[model samples]
Structure formats: structure tokens, C-alpha cells
Target: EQRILKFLEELGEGKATTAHDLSGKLGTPKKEINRVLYSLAKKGKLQKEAGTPALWKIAVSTQ
Candidate 1:
């Protein structure tokens, strides 16, 4: 499912997350989720908090 963005945009905002929860919720593999997260973060479509498990922001929509 392409609901990753939707999931993060909604539940992920202001919420701490790890690939575990996302995988659990989406029934996606953790490695795949991690890959997507890193890619999004790298592209600036998402923000990742360093060394805090993990968290993200959909920053692209703010502009």
C-alpha cells in the first residue's frame, strides 16, 4: 500500500515512531519501512530525529 505518507502525515506528526510500529500497523516489512523512511528523510520529504529511536515529519507539505 502507498499509505506510508498518509500514515506518517497523520499518526506520525508530533509522534515518536520506529519502523517497528509502522511495520506492525501497515503489515509491511521493517526493512522496507526503514528504507522508505530513510529515502523520504534524505529527500527532505520527511524529517528524522537523530538517536531517539526514530521519528519523522512531512515537511514538504509545509511549503
Candidate 2:
């Protein structure tokens, strides 16, 4: 779970990501990736960008 979350943080540091992108990068099934994403979001570690097929980004404080 930490590894998966780290990957998401790294990816978001460079650009926004979708579940499909994460699935391809992590070589995991999309459904599995989505589950992880939801977990992260619920933990307040990630945020979903509004729009069709919403994208995701890590939630980090700049301060």
C-alpha cells in the first residue's frame, strides 16, 4: 500500500493521473488500482480533479 501510494505521489509531482495511467505504470489491473486510489482519497492523501473521468492528484502541503 505504501509503495502504491508513493507511486501516486511521484506521478502527481510531475502530472495528473487517471486510474488507467496508474494501472499501466504499476502493471496492475485497473480495478485494483481504483481500489487503492479510493483508499488513498479516503485517507486525505489524494484528491480527485473534477471533470469527466476525473483525474487524481496527491494532496500535500507546501508549507
Candidate 3:
């Protein structure tokens, strides 16, 4: 899970970052970045904002 952890660690708790930005930050392809982002989302590790270009941030739970 290093690939996923890479973004999680880079992003920290709550910093809205874009996929394209992630592509460069992680040196991973777009398809792969998207996959990692989606997987992180599924695990409640990140937040997805709705818009033309969605933004991603580490999911912060009230708990």
C-alpha cells in the first residue's frame, strides 16, 4: 500500500489537491493516480469535492 500511503502522507489531514497535481507529485500516471485517489476515497481516507475538476483532501472524521 505504499502507493496509496504516498499520497496520504503527502496530503496530510486536509489539503485540497488535484489529480493533475498528484500526477506530478507522486510521479505516477493519471490512470494510476486516479485509481489511488478512488481507492483512498473508498476507504474514507480522502474527501472528494464536486466540481468541473474535483478536488481531493484527506478525509477528516469528527470522531
Candidate 4:
């Protein structure tokens, strides 16, 4: 979970991605990647773009 966050941090803010992209880059299965993504979205750690081929990115810190 935290591992994914680290990767996203490297990707930086405004870098949109997909579970497939993350899966291959992180060496995790797509299914597992999606799980983590959904979890993060719930916690407001990630933002899911509306539409097909879902795009995701780190939620900009409000601080």
C-alpha cells in the first residue's frame, strides 16, 4: 500500500496513470493494483478520472 504511494510520489502530482501502467511498472498484477487504487481513492489519497480506461493520479495535498 505504502509502496504504491512511493511510486506515485516519484511520478509526482498531475501525472495521470492507469492500473495497467502501474501494474507493469510496479511488477504487481493488475487486479492487485486496482485493489490498491480503489483503497487509496476511498482514503482520498488518489483521484480517479471519469470515463473509460480509468486514469488516476495522486490527490494534490491540500496543505
- State which candidate has the highest lDDT: 4
- Give candidate 1's whole-model lDDT: 0.68
- Candidate 2 scores a C-alpha RMSD against the true structure in Å of 2.5
lDDT of 3 by residue, 8-53 (tens): 6675676677889868886879988777777878888777788626
Those runs of model 2 whose alpha carbons end farther than 4 Å from true positions after fitting are 11-14, 60-63
For every model shown, the clashing-pair count is: 0, 0, 0, 0
Output the worst ten-in-a-row residue range by lDDT, candidate 2. Answer: 7-16
2 versus 3: better lDDT goes to: 2
- Tens digits of per-residue lDDT for model 1 on 1-63? 258767666774555567777788868887788778777777776766765365655663543
The per-model lDDT (C-alpha) reads: 0.68, 0.72, 0.72, 0.79
TM per prediction? 0.68, 0.71, 0.68, 0.79
**Highest TM-score: which candidate?**
4
Ranking by TM-score: 4, 2, 3, 1
How many clashing pairs in candidate 4?
0
Question: Alpha carbon lDDT of residue 26, candidate 4?
Answer: 65
State the TM-score for model 2. 0.71
lDDT of 4 by residue, 18-61 (tens): 78787788689987877777789889988777853768888855
In the range 1-63, model 2's lDDT, one tens digit per residue, is 688677766664635778887778769897788777778877988777785368877774433
TM-score of 4: 0.79
